[model samples]
Target: SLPIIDIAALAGSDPAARRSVAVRIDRACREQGFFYVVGHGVEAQLVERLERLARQFFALDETSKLRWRMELGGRAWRGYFPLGGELTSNRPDWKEGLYLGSELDAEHPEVRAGTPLHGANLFPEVPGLRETLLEYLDATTRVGHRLMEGIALGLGLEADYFAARYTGDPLILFRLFNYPSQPVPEGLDVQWGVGEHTDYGLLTLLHQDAIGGLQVRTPQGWLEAPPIPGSFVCNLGDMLERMTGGLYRSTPHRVARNTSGRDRLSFPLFFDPNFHARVQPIEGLPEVPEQDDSARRWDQANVHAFHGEYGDYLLNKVAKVFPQLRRDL
Candidate 1:
């Protein structure tokens, strides 16, 4: 059996008892970009209930479902992201997503154009969706926070050092995604699901129901990471790499469409860091020159042909919305 970690023990009420656990966690982080966690705080019953609700939402009629598309940025991020809406890893995603953030008021607290990231969320009129999703988000956030703390410990950090940076009732946006079957097209070949890319957030906790097609790049090359029941796959995201200063990695990973059956689903919770707390280099991690790239955030050198953060994101975001959209400069 693959090494399964009991996260609850580390997060339990005894600091002295968890020292070894901390070392093991860091070893796992350095050796593997992904791992399976067990004994996490979230209830299994809640997982079942939320899963059932996701299937129900995806099962709704197309006309009714169309209302959630990210047509308008304010309400869209918290709703359905249509298939082929954006490119992940340079590949067009065959799946459609319900991308949502924390439940915050857009009027004053969240000031990013009062968009969906902090604005209102799109709720399915179908009964129980709102409550089901909210419950799942709450449960997952606890688990994610604990996992983040583990990462901190693994790197010789104070057990709850990162916990403070993650507080303020931060986000746990549930991406209820469905990967569909690829249709045969004539004379044109574009990939589906995703290309090889790394995540921009902290950690990605993924679960899938059968029809598996998730893969990762390891020393052995590409290996499929199919869903193993009673276990969920957790991968390090960019924020973790940033936090640990390259001691841990946000490994290059990708997903693909399943050809067997189109009824595929997965949940990816993207946790937003505490607003005022900056993502800076830490003393816990080993020194690495490449890891100190946070300096580039100011010079905009890493913008990679894109301008400021807003300009870089806006250009990419608009390219998908309007195929002809491009920078005039």
Candidate 2:
């Protein structure tokens, strides 16, 4: 089982309590690159409302759902996409989802400058969805900040290490995914809900419903990451791994096709660096032995060799997920 870390002390005035949590966080970061977080302070009522409203939106007819399709999102990359619209390792995923980010108006400088992945979200006609999602974003973003503080402390750096440099103005990306039930694949023609891959940002906080199929790659081999009530499954991402020079892994994970005869829902909110932040290895860390990891990575892409603006890396990666959309842009 992944460690269950209660982070309520991170918000308290006691430094020792916060450090104790950080120590566990440090161990999890190095050993498994994943953990279950409780006492994160997000309201259960808000989560229920968001989940119900999302189900209602997904239940709409294809024509109704297409009204806010990804094409309408343009460069902003916000809106809905049908099942098989997203790809992992060049194979279509057996899930549909809605994409969202920090809501910015057309008049905002970044929006006006034609920034990719920056702009307002497209909302379905479902009542309270727009309001509920925005509230959830605000709430989760705070959790992201708190977790970063814990990470910095764990690294033996000032708590503001990340905030002062890269994430003071974070680039938040959120997704609401629905995986419909499917029969288990029979042979070499295997089907996956989402193929094996690591996330692209600094951190991903996932809220998965009880019908769980999530799995993580570990030294002991693949392990199930089943849902624990009121906990968010947290995982490190590629950027975090890069910054730590492989001391903390960006573990590969995947979801199996749902077979429980019920729709499976998951909320993954990516807390990432600002678009313009220049990513570099953290200073003063022990020199890590240079090793090639592409042989083990699903895409055979080495994140450690990447350099430059976070936006450039993000755009290049996302374009592969939706080639036609990239052409449209």
Candidate 3:
């Protein structure tokens, strides 16, 4: 079993406690790329209820669930998402998810008006969904802040550089993903509950049931990150690596279907920059080798920005959701 790291210690009220844990964090991204975070602040009861609600939601008759799908509102932005939207494929994931939260509003009262990516949340019919998520959002943000502190320390920058950028804190999205088991599309080597791709953001705090569906690409090849009880398995996102000039890694990993009787329930908390955060490789580290730049760029640009030119793809993405772009843009 991997050791459970207390996240609060990583960002303690006491300077000594915070510095003591900095040693563990300094190499976590560069070498480990994954850690089991326990004292992450998400309540066990809340996570348990969330898992139960997800099972109950997915168990509802398919047609009934489809009525309020992500397509029903936000133009495939809000509610239920079907299994097949993994792009250019009938080979869909064996799962579904309810996408909601404070990440897609044209304007938010919570922050400066016209702040991007903080507007609405979706509430499911499942019991205690909203309340559980509210508890989760509060706790996960704490975890995110703590982890950011580690990232700051690891980079040899000011210990609070990352946290300073997130005071109003930018945007955070929590996904309640249900990876179900269905027949894989014939001849398709779909290797993930989602798939093998690196994230394009800051970091992902992924918590799931005690199943062994997650694996990461490593110097040792694929290593399984089996879910341990009471721990959230976390991986870095691409944006952080870029910001840190590649000192950190947003390593690629994928989710696979589990053989257990229980379906997999994953909650991936994304900690991202507030709007208008500029990005580039870090200042002092070795540049990402030239050989790898093109592949990384294509994957980064295409996946995030499709149906338009690469730059256009990302530029207009936010416009699709924000009606008041000039004001909110």
Candidate 4:
């Protein structure tokens, strides 16, 4: 079972409480690379409103949804995609999704410079959708930074180490996904909602619906990561593993089934490094060790092989995801 962390301790008056929570966080990140964080402080009502608007947008007809598709987002790469439009392991996934990121208007320098993934979101026509999502993004960005504080302290660094150095101006990305059950046909291989894959960021804060399906790979085997009533499931990503010199793993996970025989929705927010942040082993930590076979991530592209800016790595990955958009750029 994944450890349940009461995140309120990070804000408690007692220093000992904070230290104890930090130790727990370190242990979780090392041994499991995944944990359930309760008392995360984001209002449940806010999340509900987000879900309501997301459902409203997804329920639209194909043509209406297509109006906000990724092709339209271009350099920003914001907007929606229909089921089977996204691929995992080179196979189409059985899910529909919307991609949103930190909002920057034409006035922003990056937008004017023609920067990739640096423009305003292509929101749907649904009333209140953009407002609700912008609110949610702001709240989660704050929450992500707070959790990074715990992570830094857990690593024996200053509470604001991650904030001051890596995530001062973070590259935040959000995904709203809906996984619907696929009818099993005779004499064919079973289809999964998403294939095995690892995220390409620092941390991923996942908000999942009550209908369970998420699973994490463990030494024991695949373990079902069922949703807790008031918790967000947090997991380390490849960049974090690189920063820790492989001390903390970036575990492989996937959304497997819609056990309730209905639609399952999830929102995963990526708390990533700054667009130009350089990632390497933290200084004075344990020396890098021989590669662990089991710790090898699912992606063919190696994080260690890249020495460019985070944006270079990110844009390359995004290009692969949407070839036509890359061509358009």
Which candidate tops lDDT?
2
Q: After superposition, how far is residue 129 of candidate 2 from its true place, in Å?
A: 0.7
The lDDT of each candidate is: 0.64, 0.84, 0.64, 0.80
lDDT of 1 by residue, 43-117 (tens): 777777777788888887766777875553343255676665443222434677676766665455544553323
Better of 1 and 2 by TM-score: 2
Question: By lDDT, highest first, what's the ranking?
Answer: 2, 4, 3, 1
**Model 4, which residues run further than 4 Å from truth?**
12-14, 85-93, 185-194, 292-306, 324-329
Q: What is the lDDT of residue 187 in candidate 2?
A: 60
RMSD of each: 5.3, 3.5, 5.2, 3.3
For model 3, the run of ten residues with the poorest summed lDDT: 305-314
The reply for model 2, stretches above 4 Å from the true place, is 85-93, 186-189, 192-194, 290-306, 323-329
Backbone clashes counted, model 2: 0
Assess every candidate by TM-score.
Answer: 0.80, 0.91, 0.79, 0.90
Residue 170 CA displacement from its true place in model 1, Å: 2.6
- Candidate 3 residue lDDT tens string, 129-174: 7777777878778788778787676666666786664424545767
Task: Write one digit per residue (lDDT tens) for candidate 4, span 1-329.
Answer: 99999988776557788888889899999888999998878889998888888888888898999999987787777888887643322232368899899999889887787767778888899999999999989988888987898998898888888888779999999999987765444364446434788888889999988887788986567899998878899999887887687777789988764535677889999998887777655765675577555235522365532466777777767777776434543
Worst 10 residues of 2 by lDDT: 84-93
1 or 2: which has the higher lDDT?
2
Cα misplacement distance, residue 155 of candidate 2 (Å): 0.7
Error of 4 at 75 (Å): 0.6
